[PDB]
Design a protein around this ligand. Structure first.
Ligand SMILES: Nc1ncnc2c1ncn2[C@@H]1O[C@H](COP(=O)(O)OP(=O)(O)OP(=O)(O)O)[C@@H](O)[C@H]1O
Ligand SMILES: Nc1ncnc2c1ncn2[C@@H]1O[C@H](COP(=O)(O)OP(=O)(O)OP(=O)(O)O)[C@@H](O)[C@H]1O
Ligand SMILES: Nc1ncnc2c1ncn2[C@@H]1O[C@H](COP(=O)(O)OP(=O)(O)OP(=O)(O)O)[C@@H](O)[C@H]1O
Ligand SMILES: Nc1ncnc2c1ncn2[C@@H]1O[C@H](COP(=O)(O)OP(=O)(O)OP(=O)(O)O)[C@@H](O)[C@H]1O
Ligand SMILES: Nc1ncnc2c1ncn2[C@@H]1O[C@H](COP(=O)(O)OP(=O)(O)OP(=O)(O)O)[C@@H](O)[C@H]1O
Ligand SMILES: Nc1ncnc2c1ncn2[C@@H]1O[C@H](COP(=O)(O)OP(=O)(O)OP(=O)(O)O)[C@@H](O)[C@H]1O
Ligand code: MOO
Ligand code: MOO
Ligand code: MOO
Ligand code: MOO
Lengths: 268, 245, 245, 245, 268, 245
């Protein structure tokens, strides 16, 4: 293996060529923002609930950013479900619903961003990324919309028109792309259970589990978008994630301090 | 039931970046063929990336960059090929249009003029999927995702080879390479070895909703693109496994 | 004398967000009616916001946000309804266009195609006026400001009710609600009680320069929009108090 | 050999900012003349800056600002004149288009509609050349750079004077000012003294590839622009020193 | 000379008028970013070479920005030459090739920017300029694409369709516009020689030379784009430039410290 | 005052029958030039008769037939040349149209398509004037009568020679034939000797109301027709003695 061998294959073979693919796998691995943590703030599970859920999390973000670099992504929530319902009923395809859902995540980022503005924390976009490096350096945090940019090019699910890659996937892929050290999903339950705790009365809490174990237990589509689990098994940089209850005061803070609150889901 | 077709009268044509890489010798006849097709079809013409993307992958991988950094770098090269092709067609009223215009205003632009040119790469950008160090969702894949989302009448992939063979017909094993006039995406997906189309194209064909077949044809042979847009069998047909309504 | 008319041949149609909120059952017949109107009129179709804006007002007010933060949040919902409606009309050459395109390039876009769709909310954004915690310049108001600035031939407001009544016909007092076939903006402005149109619509009608009357009609009754665009009286006529030149 | 012509059927018309500065008295007849030309020619109409750019140069130079700061400030004024002229032509389907649209999508826009309006100033911006404290690449220069890059059929410069004289015909020496019906760019470049066209226009004429002659005509005389676009000699012809292919 | 005399001429004479031109020349001269240095990182001579050339320069940039304010522009390189070749063969004009070349400089700025992001250094654009003042203030450096914005309005050369103003000119004009104190071209040779050192075996190194001397020696089109030499003679603020070898460890650092590495080219 | 212009944006091009008589060698380049002009001008293309009319004059005169019998016989040959030229342009949307359509529906036909082809001979038919045994009102004369009645922007006569000479440049005296770059109709009318244009063309120029000049150019030299339609001087200019309004 060497640079020249890789360049020769890159020139002479299709990118589909297994030999090229394998030489590309041996390339060095640079992490762009290795000291940052990505946090997803759930749309339905947090922001849609208003002040009682959002204000304590704003306070935690403001306290946290003294010792932690944070990229804070927003979910979408009930207005996206309403849009999905209207558009699906008209027969529109998943790529059109994907565009509609992004606007709701953008709304949520704008609302969260306005509560954080006086602390210097911007909503980014516009520039995309490169407002990120300066903001992270100076103010230690930025807010972004969590929906992936695929829009009309969204791959559809096997069945139905709901976009399969939504704001859990968007935030996860940003953590993976930047090589961040940590990915925290902030939801409205303590973590993963053996069943949906809102539907089932005797579900059991799961502190730690791998993707394969989750699949073997029927939990592919539970507290995270199920494609995220497959993205996690493919990831180069973020090989586990943590799901915590944002409605518990201090849970985000304690997760950033290394406490094992919530559920840790591992790629293997 | 399946989603409606947004632009059922649209024909999508993807031009391989390596066709563009051959320069005037390939581009001038292709432009003359496209010129003659403009009064026959409503065309969305999407360009791939070609060899310059291989160069920026070599530099980017040497610098250690992740797959979400390489994806927009390659997409740039497909946009440049699109600007070149559109310039050659400008006097026919053809211009290059950016990805947001394709996603949101294609109908008005194809009402203004007979064809527009855009980049075939999809805007996955820094949210490209991990796993390979080479961006998987490239020009074949983006063009198909678009054509199928629109419910277009067809997608034709215009390459520098006659179609798909059992081995790379420009590669080491080219002596045992046999031409395949027809295949299914599911059979290709189970094969190993290189293809003239993205492997992710076969995955998005499995979830497709409208387009039943995609033809790969040699753009270096005048007349093949014209024949393919009339449904004539002149390259390799790929069956997507959409089944009729 | 009064300003010239920029687009005197334009017809502006504002679609209430709550019509869109009813989903396919309301949207499909309205799309079919719009399809038939495209060869008869040059249309600027502008969508309102509907119930999702009520939800984001509930969240935003619960977070304490000021009226200039709520105004662009509601405007987003009107843009989404515009993207949905335009998608349904894409095969007719109709696309959604952004506010800058409406303000600066509407003439070229209506030369390219028979109708375009945009958001009815005006871009007051963080410069919305204070006083109410609810943004005052909403979809009815923005559509009228545009139609009158252009000197358009008409503005028709398409709602989920037959027109204006003396009380909310879906509200507590609906039993004493009497239909008003005709009224003036100045008489409505002096009334208290709810209306199916923004109160700020009545204020901008008082400073209007061109549009003398605006009809509110029921988009859930096929054929009423068609009849209104020919000047037939099928809902409530609002006289702006523009007087002839 | 020379580069191809991108838009060989295009006519480019540059309107001096000082014509616009005269207000309705000059603009209304010019708009009426442009209206009549729309069915005869495919037009790119580009506006200059006029007196407001002189004011912002006075303020900017008083603040010490360099030539790359003054260039976009003047360009703004040419864009404003373009918005005014386009508004007057809106009912004919004419809109103002931004510099990126001119550079990349002019073909589709001139397929949608008969004429578009843009700014004649080129986007040199903070990368304007140093040497003079006055930006050298102004409206005449930008319009010619565009017309020649496109390989357009002509560029006509519409001014508030009949053409080029041997001295400023509104200046101190106006008594010895003799009209020049024809001249070459190389002869003008060797003269000292003021001109009604940018001196940098003469420099870009020396490297031109397509346009052989540019006519300067009086837009305050109805009918001269019409005659110039048919090649009639009604002002000053400038020979670029392109020589035939 | 006075403000009122200048305003009267500005109102009453063509901008072509020599008397106006001369009164404008006497105006005060404000430098926008007088404490900054512009650095061009060559596309073919540095970035195209990959890690072995770029990583040491990233380290120098990161060390340098503690004591120096830096505007770092990128060149284009071999992918632009490929585009120029394709487009020239089709007969396309210089203004179309100019647009194509900018995209390659943008690619190079994005790659360099990602290696610098964790140090807070953004790629600018988007905002154009005014991301520059804030970034320079806070993080002491920014990365930009070096191609001028002329695009379709590029003046052509006397012969051929290659854009004459490329990334040497773009970076130079930005230094001149901002009134920066210093302009450093980072290439892959020690400096100027009496002949191309890659083609000629007995070329002699030139530590310092004026533009006129370079012309008199046949060196108009050698290590810098030849239009840059004419721009330099016209410049108000940047009246000399330095060419250094970016492949020599520490050369950039030493040039920023005032050491005479490389070649200094003077306007007069 | 003079009559209004009916179609002031029209360009009329008369193609000599003897150009058509040269067959593909002349016709194919001329068709390719016309194809490129279609997006630049609104064209009425009118064909003359050529050598076949000489043959039918020989037969008709041998049978004793009067000038009103020979006139429609020659006109037939001009119509045939028009059908041939239109067929070659059919794929561009060009068709031949009959004399009544030219006289009454030209505006709608030039709204449908960029150019139409008709016969240049006027319908004088059995009411041709007596005096010569050769019909006087032929193709040059009919094309000018039409162009001037419409108030067209120009008439260009496309021949197999460079323009008018002092003697027939293909005739006995061709050695003393001197080229005339410019002349007036009144000076030609006072000369004796042959011309490449009908003598009756000079008579109808004396009563003309709109067209001031007519250019005769060599259609066998690619590019001359294009240049003439932009007013460039590349053949013989004939001044009609219309004087400006
Ligand atoms: N096995 C499980 N354990 C825990 N929670 C579960 C399980 N199965 C389903 N859930 C549900 O998933 C929800 C969390 O996902 P949800 O999509 O609501 O969060 P979100 O991130 O706010 O979504 P968005 O941001 O897309 O609005 C919980 O409220 C819970 O009711
Ligand atoms: N089994 C195969 N059959 C046919 N061609 C193959 C096969 N395997 C590899 N190839 C190669 O695929 C090449 C074309 O695909 P490639 O990605 O190289 O170019 P492209 O499609 O023009 O690029 P882009 O994806 O940027 O548009 C062919 O020239 C051929 O050598
Ligand atoms: N006096 C009244 N007459 C008629 N309708 C009334 C009256 N007062 C209240 N309304 C209510 O107004 C509703 C329509 O206006 P509303 O703002 O709710 O929807 P919309 O116009 O679709 O929304 P948007 O402004 O976002 O477009 C009706 O359904 C009706 O119940
Ligand atoms: N030798 C000359 N011949 C003719 N006009 C001259 C000459 N020298 C100076 N001028 C002046 O040039 C003026 C027009 O050029 P000017 O730049 O002032 O306006 P403009 O072209 O309308 O502006 P812009 O360049 O912003 O479009 C004339 O009004 C005239 O007084
Ligand atoms: N007289 C000379 N002295 C030194 N170098 C010279 C001379 N003449 C030519 N050169 C060549 O110029 C090259 C530097 O310019 P080059 O354009 O390669 O750099 P660059 O800034 O990387 O370009 P870009 O950024 O446009 O890719 C050197 O590699 C050298 O071979
Ligand atoms: N003085 C002259 N100058 C130029 N050509 C002349 C002159 N006298 C005679 N001719 C002849 O006129 C011929 C062209 O006119 P002619 O009527 O023969 O053809 P045409 O215009 O193609 O026919 P039609 O009138 O049927 O269109 C030339 O080929 C030339 O030999
Ligand atoms: O890119 Mo356009 O959006 O031709 O009105
Ligand atoms: O501005 Mo568009 O949005 O050329 O169709
Ligand atoms: O790009 Mo426009 O500005 O589709 O009319
Ligand atoms: O029938 Mo007409 O009368 O093809 O315009």
């Amino acid at each position: 293996n060497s640079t020249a061998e890789l360049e020769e294959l890159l020139m002479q073979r299709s990118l589909t060529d297994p030999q090229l693919q394998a030489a590309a796998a041996a390339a060095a691995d640079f992490r762009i923002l290795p000291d940052a943590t990505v946090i997803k703030i759930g749309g339905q599970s947090v922001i849609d609930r208003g002040r009682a859920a959002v204000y304590p999390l704003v306070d935690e973000i403001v306290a946290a950013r003294k010792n932690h670099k944070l990229l804070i992504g927003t979910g979408a929530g009930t207005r996206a479900r309403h849009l999905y319902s209207i558009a699906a009923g008209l027969g529109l395809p998943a790529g059109v619903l994907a565009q509609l859902g992004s606007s709701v995540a953008d709304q949520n980022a704008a609302m969260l961003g306005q509560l954080l503005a006086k602390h210097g924390i911007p909503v980014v976009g516009g520039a995309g990324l490169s407002a990120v490096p300066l903001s992270l350096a100076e103010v230690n945090a930025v807010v972004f919309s969590g929906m992936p940019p695929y829009k009309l090019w969204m791959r559809p699910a096997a069945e139905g028109v709901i976009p399969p890659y939504r704001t859990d996937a968007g935030c996860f892929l940003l953590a993976e792309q930047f090589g961040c050290k940590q990915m925290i999903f902030v939801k409205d339950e303590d973590g993963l259970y053996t069943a949906n705790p809102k539907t089932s009365k005797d579900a059991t809490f799961i502190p730690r589990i791998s993707v394969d174990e989750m699949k073997a237990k029927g939990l592919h589509d539970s507290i995270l978008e199920f494609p995220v689990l497959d993205l996690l098994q493919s990831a180069q940089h973020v090989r586990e994630v943590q799901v915590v209850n944002g409605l518990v005061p201090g849970n985000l803070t304690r997760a950033l301090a290394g406490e094992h609150v919530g559920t840790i889901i591992t790629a293997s | 039931k399946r989603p409606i077709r947004l632009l059922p009268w649209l024909q999508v044509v993807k031009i391989g970046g390596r066709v563009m890489d051959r320069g005037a010798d390939a581009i001038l006849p292709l432009v003359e063929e496209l010129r003659k097709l403009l009064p026959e079809h409503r065309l969305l013409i999407l360009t791939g990336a070609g060899v310059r993307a291989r160069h920026v992958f070599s530099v980017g991988l040497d610098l250690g960059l992740p797959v979400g950094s390489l994806a927009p770098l390659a997409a740039s090269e497909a946009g440049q090929n699109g600007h070149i092709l559109a310039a050659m067609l400008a006097s026919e009223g053809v211009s290059y249009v950016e990805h947001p215009t394709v996603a949101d205003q294609l109908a008005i632009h194809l009402s203004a003029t007979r064809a527009v040119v855009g980049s075939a790469f999809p805007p996955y950008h820094h949210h490209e999927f991990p796993g390979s160090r080479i961006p998987p969702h490239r020009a074949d894949t983006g063009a198909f995702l678009l054509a199928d989302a629109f419910g277009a009448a067809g997608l034709t992939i215009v390459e520098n080879v006659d179609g798909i063979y059992t081995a790379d017909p420009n590669g080491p094993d080219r002596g045992q390479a046999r031409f395949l006039p027809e295949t299914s995406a599911t059979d290709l997906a189970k094969s190993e070895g290189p293809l003239p189309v993205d492997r992710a194209l076969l995955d998005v064909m499995a979830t497709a909703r409208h387009i039943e077949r995609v033809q790969v044809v040699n753009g270096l042979v005048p007349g093949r693109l014209t024949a393919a847009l009339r449904g004539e069998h002149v390259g390799t047909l790929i069956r997507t496994g959409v089944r009729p309504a």
